[PDB]
Amino acid sequence: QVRPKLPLLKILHAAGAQGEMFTVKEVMHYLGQYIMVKQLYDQQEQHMVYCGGDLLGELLGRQSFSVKDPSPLYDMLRKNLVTLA
Ligand SMILES: COc1cccc2c(C(=O)N[C@H]3CCN(c4ccc(C)cc4)C3)c[nH]c12
Numbered sequence: 001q002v003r004p005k006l007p008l009l010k011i012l013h014a015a016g017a018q019g020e021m022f023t024v025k026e027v028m029h030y031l032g033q034y035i036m037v038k039q040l041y042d043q044q045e046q047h048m049v050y051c052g053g054d055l056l057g058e059l060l061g062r063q064s065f066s067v068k069d070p071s072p073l074y075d076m077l078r079k080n081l082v083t084l085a
Contacts, residue, residue, distance in 0.1 A: 001022070001023050001024055001083070001084055002021075002022055002023070002024055002027060002081040002082060002083060002084060003020050003021055003022070003081070003082045003084060004020065004022070004027065004080055004081055004082075005079075005080045005081075005082065007055060007058070007059045007080070008027075008059065008076070008077075008080040008081070010055060011030075011031070011034050011055055011056060011059070012027065012030040012031070012034070014034060014038070014055075015030040015031070015033040015034035015037065016030070016033060017030045021084065024077075024081075027077065027081065031073070034056070035049055035056075038054065040054060040056065047066050047067050047068055048064060048065075048066045049064060049065055049066070049067075050063065050064050051063065051064060051065065052064065059076060059080070060072050060073075060076055
């Protein structure tokens with residue numbers, strides 16, 4: 001359903017994704033895998049993600065966010081996913 005722009009594509013590939021065409025659910029899956037395997041979540045308060053000094057933070061223009069309100073990821077996906085025909 002979607003194709004990611006370069007910085008997002010790099011993140012998904014770092015999480016084990018192949019190619020450049022994905023479903024939205026796949027993108028969400030690989031973003032979660034990325035955060036887990038790169039240990040970006042806060043170690044004591046896992047709802048928080050420290051993305052500063054990572055490509056994800058560069059892409060979001062944030063040092064941190066929380067799943068208490070994951071709106072920054074929504075904005076990023078709107079800007080970085082091309083809808084496929
Ligand atoms: C141990 O702790 C964690 C492990 C893995 C992942 C996480 C995590 C987090 O932000 N997952 C993201 C993954 C994609 N996603 C998302 C949310 C909203 C939209 C619109 C799109 C995608 C939420 C926070 N703690 C984690």
